[PDB]
A paper describes a structure:
We chose [name], a ligand-inducible aTF belonging to the diverse TetR-like protein family, as a target for computational engineering of ligand specificity. [name] is a 1-component transcriptional system and represents the simplest molecular mechanism for converting biophysical interaction between inducer and protein into a complex biological response like transcription. When induced, ligand-binding allosterically lowers affinity for DNA, thereby allowing transcription. [name] is a compact, dimeric, all-helical transcription factor with a large cavity between five angled helices forming the ligand-binding pocket.
The crystal structure of the computationally designed mutant shows that one of the mutations reshapes the binding pocket to favor resveratrol over naringenin through a striking change in its binding orientation while maintaining allostery. Unlike [name] which plays a clear steric role, the other three mutations ([name], [name] and [name]) have a more subtle effect in reshaping the binding pocket through nonpolar interactions. [name] mutation creates a protrusion in the binding pocket that increases shape complementarity to resveratrol. [name] is buried between the residues in the binding pocket and the dimerization helix and may play a role in positioning the [name] tryptophan to stabilize its horizontal orientation through van der Waals interactions. [name] allows the formation of multiple hydrogen bonds with nearby water molecules and may serve to stabilize the structure.
Author numbering:
A (entry chain B): 3 to 210
B (entry chain A): 4 to 210
The structure:
Amino acid sequence: RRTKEEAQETRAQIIEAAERAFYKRGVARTTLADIAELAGVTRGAIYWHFNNKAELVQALLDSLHETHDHLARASESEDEVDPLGCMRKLLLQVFNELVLDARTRRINEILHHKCEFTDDMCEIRQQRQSAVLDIHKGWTLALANAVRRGQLPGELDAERAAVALYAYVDGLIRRWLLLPDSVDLLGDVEKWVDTGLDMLRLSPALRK
Amino acid sequence: RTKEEAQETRAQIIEAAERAFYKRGVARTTLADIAELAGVTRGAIYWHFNNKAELVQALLDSLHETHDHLARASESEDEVDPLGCMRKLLLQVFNELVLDARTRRINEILHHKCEFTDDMCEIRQQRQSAVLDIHKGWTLALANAVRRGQLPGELDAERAAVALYAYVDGLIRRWLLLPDSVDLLGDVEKWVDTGLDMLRLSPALRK
Ligand SMILES: Oc1ccc(/C=C/c2cc(O)cc(O)c2)cc1
Ligand SMILES: Oc1ccc(/C=C/c2cc(O)cc(O)c2)cc1
Ligand SMILES: [Mg+2]
Ligand SMILES: [Mg+2]
């Protein structure tokens, strides 16, 4: 009965339908008019909320980080006493949500496997670059905090370690999406997280 | 001769497919689009490829060729240094990615420009088959390294092959996305050894 609350409901309906449409048919061939029909909204309504498909993809991508922001900011805090432990809790929660939450799984599948970078829609690649650079900045600081607190080797190259951890986690998530019944990500989640952290703690190649 | 002409036509089609897929992506490119870009007519592309998924697979299969010698060596139970063969394999994989325009662009197509959205689902099915085949070979090569004492005796060879694939595949994709951020060629030894150190040293990878 109020403008803002009805707008928020319509926006959520559009995003939910976009996840269903992109997951089934992919981003390239899905139109906003298609998503409007699936959502039960008018074309005027969808173009009111989103200028183009790139803005809907970004809404999906930006929706992933809210769950973990509390543990991420803690790991990045220069006053946090256990930054490596916050990083481990962050990685456990990432994997747990991926396996358990149908929405998170479907969005990750869309971004990994149903969404092309093409220069006719250059914003998709540009916004993915910004998201990964932002993650890298956070993890570089979290790992530097861990080194200062004696939880990681003193000569750790924090930048390269953050890249190595991102490579491993992102590669494991994509492998699981491709071949889920191949790897028990939920049952062995602690093992999978600790494999990545062990690389950072123990590999001499990651020292300066 | 018919045989040499058909081989040249196939190569012309595959080269045009790389150009077309890189520019416009796989989803919206048809075989008819690729044939026009290749200068190939009278329906010849359909004599070479049953559908677009087969052309994607041809690009994917072309990546194995350079590395086959080192991969088979690493998997041979007669090889004396199966971990060293795997190291040389990963060095070449990263070197070719940075140096070879064709390998780089094919990887960019498969990682970033190729939706799992075809009718017969063959694009996803063949990617699954390809990764399972890599996994089978890497599990064998790591099991050979364990047998030679080059990796821990209690290593979970299957999980270690998954962890190494995750790291390597993730690092390649990370580099394709942000090439100015990772000196893949300059520090290639460090990047390869970081991954091999994970398998050699992580207790989480032991049974
Ligand atoms: O494949 C993936 C690779 C990396 C990540 C990281 C997510 C993440 C989420 C946060 O809230 C803070 C952060 O610093 C990182 C998620 C998935
Ligand atoms: O990210 C990756 C990029 C390339 C590869 C190649 C693996 C490979 C496996 C084989 O059995 C034979 C071969 O010639 C290559 C694996 C992972
Ligand atoms: Mg969430
Ligand atoms: Mg090659």
